[PDB]
Amino acid sequence: LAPSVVTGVAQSSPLTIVTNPKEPRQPVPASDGADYLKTIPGFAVIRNGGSNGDPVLRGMFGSRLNILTNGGMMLGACPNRMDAPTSYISPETYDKLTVIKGPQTVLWGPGASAGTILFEREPERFGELGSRVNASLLAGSNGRFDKVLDAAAGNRLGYLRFTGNHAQSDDYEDGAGNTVPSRWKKWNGDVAVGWTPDEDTLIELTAGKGDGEARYAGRGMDGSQFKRESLGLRFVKSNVSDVLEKVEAQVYYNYADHIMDNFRLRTPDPSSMMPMPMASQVDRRTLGGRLAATWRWDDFKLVTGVDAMRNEHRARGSKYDMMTDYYTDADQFPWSKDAVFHNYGAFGELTWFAAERDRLIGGLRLDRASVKDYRQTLKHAMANPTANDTRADTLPSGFVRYEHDLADSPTTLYAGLGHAERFPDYWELFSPKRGPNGSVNAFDKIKPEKTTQLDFGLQYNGDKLQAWASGYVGVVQDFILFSYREMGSSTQATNVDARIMGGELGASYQLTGNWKTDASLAYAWGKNSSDDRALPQIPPLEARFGLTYEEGDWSAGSLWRVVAPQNRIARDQGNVVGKDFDKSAGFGVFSLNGAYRVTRNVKLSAGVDNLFDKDYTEHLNKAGDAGFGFSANETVPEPGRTFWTKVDFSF
Ligand SMILES: [Cu+2]
Hints:
This protein is mostly beta strands. It has one domain: Beta Barrel (Maltoporin, Chain A), CATH 2.40.170. β26 (449-461) and β27 form a beta hairpin. It has three helices and 36 strands. The longest helix has 5 residues, at 33-37. The chain has helices at residues 33-37, 426-430, 442-445, and strands spanning 16-19, 43-46, 54-57, 60-61, 65-69, 72-73, 96-101, 115-120, 130-140, 144-155, 158-169, 184-195, 201-214, 222-238, 244-261, 279-297, 300-317, 319-321, 326-328, 336-352, 358-373, 377-378, 382-383, 390-405, 411-422, 449-461, 465-485, 490-510, 515-528, 533-534, 542-551, 554-563, 573-574, 587-597, 602-609, 642-650. Copper (II) ion is lined by residues 78, 80, 82, 223, 258, 260. The PDB classes it as membrane protein. Keywords: metalloprotein, TonB dependent transporter, outer membrane protein, copper, Pseudomonas aeruginosa, membrane protein. It forms a monomeric assembly. Copper transporter OprC.
């Protein structure tokens, strides 16, 4: 059918979303992982600059989201989350994106209390000796330029695949005409070699690198380097026996090497708390693996397996000789290890196909998590009270979900209850300056976070009308909260009890053969029960309305995004990235797009985002750090009007 641009994604089962990330996207041509998530209702993004935003699902931040690439975990190194996991993903280079909302799966690792996000590349399917190529070129406002290449060749016995991209933009302008610090540049190059010695076997080795740079608005430093190195090995054996339908094994290794500074993408400000050249380098090395068997028999499906992960964080900093004005770069000093995390898990998921219109699913996992504090001193320099200390815990999680198809209509209803326990992450233990009151530090005292949540919803797969809704109510014991105090700003991590609820809904209607309309709504709500106040950093109610006309080889679409004010805030509280401070204003933004299929191999598309050049910001956008030339507590503005044009090739 006619090519179109993606402005919203509907829910396959409202709990599980499956998309093709190679599609043109018209709430702007993405750029990183978080931007692609923005077209799925329930997601919001903390804007940091022009790219590398931090994704938020149902008001939940950070490690509450389990974000995998080809089944592996890429962990960032920046202590202020300049490089969230999505910042390393170029999802045009992926084949499939799956989102599972809520604590409703145990198959993909521990602690995914908010949801699980799986970016995936499918194995090639060559018969006789063949090759294929997909590529794309995009150009747009403010020096935006992206190129993507995905090429593979092989036969029945194996294949070689190469994927790469290079993308960049200059600083954009907001709707008042002001330049925002926001320039960025990214590239990736990855290869996969698959060996398929028979129809029931697959072995695949993957290897890749990337790098990038980005200005950060409202921070004292920019990211001058975001190096990534990746290695993976995957095994899949199908139809091992009549009941043993699949055995999977994989190991992955991911390395991030991040540099931030105040002199390569900006000039040091003499009037700020960083008046001299300064650089910090940090790295993160992650090794992990997973083994899973899938059993199928009678009316039952069982998945069982184990997984393991180790990750290590190191840092080193520059020095500046006051008296002599001599600058010594960070790479002239040795790495200082500060943290090592481990996890080992066992998991199982049992599905009962209780007749054709009823399904019951239950999952369980038990995790042993541990961490060791390797900080020998703290920063003059001071003794670290918990030097070399270790702590560990054993955390069970699980869920049950009931799904029911109605007899007289194409309607599915579901209701599920899940319990997830999450060991605190690097940022919760090592980034805050203080722990809870009376603690020696955060490392010693912050407790695991325990979420119990009811998920429910329905979908209607009619002729002209597809509609879906998914709601949730939950409690969080020991929710990990950051509190901010104004030497510079400093943070304290605490555990609080919280209550959450919300939902997403959407519908799409084929009015005629050519006309189609769709809408979605997303709401999140949170309360801090320990202190009887709102939870911070909760995104406001948001609606989207799309209209598309398609005829033959062409299509045109338009889109309204309408966002309510957020008046539920908790001033000077937030997460390791950002804090609440001001209530946010409502806004509406309008966009246009079109597509033209030129041949079977060549497709063109184009768009205008924010047609009326609205001057606005989003509630979650990063509030400026105190102590610099920019205004503190002001959130990063969104881009003004921008144009873009894209050509897609397929051979
Ligand atoms: Cu950084």
